[PDB]
């Protein structure tokens, strides 16, 4: 932060996590209460009451668990909250599919030498599950491949770079192959050596 | 486990800052602008399919504040330990000269959720077209945040994302220039 402030800070975080397995078929609710980055007390629908996570949360677990009307509202939340919200948003979240744009450009591991790195850029896709493969003359090259890994852009899209280190020879055809749930058949982009 | 929806709220003292958001598999569905009492959908199209009554978020934050003040006293006023962010600058897509692009400043793994962020172009602050996210949750209960700067690539411009946080000794400047 700014303000030139040394004053001590105190933070309280609350998380209601709805975990879905095969859609709404199996649902688990975890309520986490967190003081200064340490979870202190938790409601787990697999249990049906609060449990203290640190001793600082013990008074709350004891007090809330004595209030059976509050427990019964939490115990129903897998239905009244988790399953409800799943149906409200599934069409634009669970079902969201955005096709990646794929480009290839040459690069260098050593700046003073020749192009020896083929970069497959795969950007703008959703969801994050993706498979990227490099081919040379129709045959996969698994050696010499490095990647950024999966990068979350913060705007419901992902990107990645997948790079192949190789010495291009005349006549070779290098092709990046991308598989993703948004497309029926793989996307391919070539680079001619 | 296919999917996780998280309602994540927080209250921070003495700043009296409180936030309320929903997360799906790591992306923000919406948050509530406390000051405007407004549901802000992360993508505008979401509000075509769903709605949320923002006023309820303010009632939640009031309880969070009360509970925070009870927990603070109960802890004998033990304060949070600052965790400084790690900062990454990247672009939305591979960079091409005078093809519009977006710089992304990704601020990660920090707490408390307070940062001062400035984009610098050639050492000078830029605010045109910038945007940002609220403070996003992590499983270790630290925070994430994204800042964005549309830009037109040029060999003559250099950029820094400057991040200030109480866990840092000095402002953190993450550099970016056209390779």
């Amino acid at each position: 932060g700014g303000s030139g402030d040394t004053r001590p800070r105190f933070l309280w975080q609350l998380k209601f996590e709805c975990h879905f397995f095969n859609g709404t078929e199996r649902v688990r609710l975890l309520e986490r209460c967190i003081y200064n980055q340490e979870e202190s007390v938790r409601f787990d629908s697999d249990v049906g009451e609060y449990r203290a996570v640190t001793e600082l949360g013990r008074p709350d677990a004891e007090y809330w668990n004595s209030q059976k009307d509050l427990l019964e509202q939490r115990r129903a939340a897998v239905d009244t909250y988790c399953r409800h919200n799943y149906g409200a948003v599934e069409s634009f979240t669970v079902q969201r599919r955005v096709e990646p744009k794929v480009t290839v450009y040459p690069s260098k591991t050593q700046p003073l030498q020749h192009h020896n790195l083929l970069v497959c850029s795969v950007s703008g896709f959703y969801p994050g599950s993706i498979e990227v493969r490099w081919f040379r003359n129709g045959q996969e090259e698994k050696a010499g491949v490095v990647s950024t890994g999966l990068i979350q852009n913060g705007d419901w899209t992902f990107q990645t770079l997948v790079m192949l280190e190789t010495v291009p020879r005349s006549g070779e055809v290098y092709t990046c192959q991308v598989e993703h749930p948004s497309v029926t058949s793989p996307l391919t982009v070539e680079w001619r050596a | 486990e296919e999917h996780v929806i998280i309602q994540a709220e927080f209250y921070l003292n003495p700043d009296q800052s409180g936030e309320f958001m929903f997360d799906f598999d790591g992306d923000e569905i919406f948050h509530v602008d406390m000051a405007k009492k407004e549901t802000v959908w992360r993508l505008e199209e979401f509000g075509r399919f769903a709605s949320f009554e923002a006023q309820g978020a303010l009632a939640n934050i009031a309880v969070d504040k009360a509970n925070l003040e009870i927990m603070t006293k109960r802890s004998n006023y033990t304060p949070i330990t600052n965790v400084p962010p790690e900062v990454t600058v990247l672009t939305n897509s591979p960079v091409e000269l005078r093809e519009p692009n977006v710089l992304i400043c990704f601020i990660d793994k920090f707490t408390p959720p307070v940062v001062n962020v400035t984009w610098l172009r050639n050492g000078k602050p830029v605010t045109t077209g910038v945007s940002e996210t609220v403070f996003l949750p992590r499983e270790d209960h630290l925070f994430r945040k994204f800042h964005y700067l549309p830009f037109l690539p040029s060999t003559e411009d250099v950029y820094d994302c400057r991040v200030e946080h109480w866990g840092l000794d000095e402002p953190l400047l993450k550099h970016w220039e056209f390779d």
Partner: peptide, 15 residues
Amino acid sequence: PVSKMRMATPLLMQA
């Protein structure tokens, strides 16, 4: 017909 999302409400601690 827009779907209405629901929020969960924190429990208040004893003062």
